[PDB]
Amino acid sequence: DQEKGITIDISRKHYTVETLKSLVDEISYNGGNYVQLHFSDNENYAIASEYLGQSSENTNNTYLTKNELLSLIAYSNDKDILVIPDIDLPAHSKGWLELIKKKDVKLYNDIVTDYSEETLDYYDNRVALDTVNQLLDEVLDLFYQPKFEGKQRIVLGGDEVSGSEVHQLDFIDFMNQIASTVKESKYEPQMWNDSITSEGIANLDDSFSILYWQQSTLSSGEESLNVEDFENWGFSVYNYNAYSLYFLPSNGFTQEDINEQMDYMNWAYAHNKFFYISDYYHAVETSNVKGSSLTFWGEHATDLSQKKLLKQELPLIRHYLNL
Numbered sequence: 001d002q003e004k005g006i007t008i009d010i011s012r013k014h015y016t017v018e019t020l021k022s023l024v025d026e027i028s029y030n031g032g033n034y035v036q037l038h039f040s041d042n043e044n045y046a047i048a049s050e051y052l053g054q055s056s057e058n059t060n061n062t063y064l065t066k067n068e069l070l071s072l073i074a075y076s077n078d079k080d081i082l083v084i085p086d087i088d089l090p091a092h093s094k095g096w097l098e099l100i101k102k103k104d105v106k107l108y109n110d111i112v113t114d115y116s117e118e119t120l121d122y123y124d125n126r127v128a129l130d131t132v133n134q135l136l137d138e139v140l141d142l143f144y145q146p147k148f149e150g151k152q153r154i155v156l157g158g159d160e161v162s163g164s165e166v167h168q169l170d171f172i173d174f175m176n177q178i179a180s181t182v183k184e185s186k187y188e189p190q191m192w193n194d195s196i197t198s199e200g201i202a203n204l205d206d207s208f209s210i211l212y213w214q215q216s217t218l219s220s221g222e223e224s225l226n227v228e229d230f231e232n233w234g235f236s237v238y239n240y241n242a243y244s245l246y247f248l249p250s251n252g253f254t255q256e257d258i259n260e261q262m263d264y265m266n267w268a269y270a271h272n273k274f275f276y277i278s279d280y281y282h283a284v285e286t287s288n289v290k291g292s293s294l295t296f297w298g299e300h301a302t303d304l305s306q307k308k309l310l311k312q313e314l315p316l317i318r319h320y321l322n323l
């Protein structure tokens with residue numbers, strides 16, 4: 001049984017609760033299993049947070065209200081869709097770090113790396129971990145879904161982490177600590193594949209499942225981890241192929257571009273075709289593949305209305321879910 005899900009970047013682009021419910025409708029209609037809500041990145045923290053100071057119970061341009069988010073989750077569960085929170089750590093963190101800076105600059109200075117305003121200090125910093133863990137505790141409560149008790153998952157990020165290749169055991173220790181936190185709330189942790197190396201794999205909590213979007217290349221020029229490697233160290237993977245299964249909605253696209261994307265998906269997508277350095281659509285014959293996801297990243301969607309976002313995304317959701 002291979003799962004299929006839709007990942008939605010609501011940090012780079014604003015989505016109303018109605019847009020999101022319409023998208024979930026389409027996921028359910030075509031038998032999709034989950035929706036991954038990527039709500040925390042550099043540009044914005046796009047859900048309500050008592051901890052971070054986003055508490056308005058009024059609809060606004062910056063974050064889903066708590067009531068809106070809970071409504072969305074309940075609507076999803078009623079249609080047998082699991083909602084997977086995605087909070088990106090320790091990089092891709094500028095949006096919530098900027099909120100901490102507002103709340104408490106002393107704390108900000110105690111937890112941000114000295115070189116990157118986008119990156120939480122994962123290099124063995126207890127106050128940084130404690131702060132993260134408080135945020136995670138709020139997120140794990142917010143996304144509680146009793147219908148899926150024992151099956152909940154949370155994406156914890158781990159993509160494009162500066163310093164992670166050199167300082168790999170610190171990165172892995174950090175990821176293991178936040179995995180511990182989510183596992184205490186009976187969530188399965190997940191992370192992207194790209195910043196884990198040969199050096200870290202043996203120390204990484206194999207409770208993690210891996211969102212495998214693009215095989216990395218090490219500073220040596222050597223290939224980084226592939227799906228067989230993950231299998232060999234006890235990790236399950238999901239196919240998030242960066243070419244076949246990424247789409248960036250844009251105001252410059254026409255209907256013809258969406259049709260082309262579907263014709264491209266016809267040949268480029270398969271459940272087990274992963275993005276490897278040698279082959280962008282590499283078929284893997286391992287036993288550790290659990291599913292796939294189409295992801296809508298938000299950074300090109302600047303001038304799109306909500307109606308136009310639906311116009312581009314609905315057909316792509318349907319086409320992917322029926323392939």
Ligand SMILES: CC(=O)N[C@H]1CN2CC[C@H](O)[C@@H]2[C@@H](O)[C@@H]1O
Pocket residue numbers: 092159160192213242246297298299
């Ligand atoms: C896991 C991942 O894809 N990470 C980044 C890189 N990808 C590549 C395609 C997008 O730019 C997207 C970007 O929005 C994401 O933040």
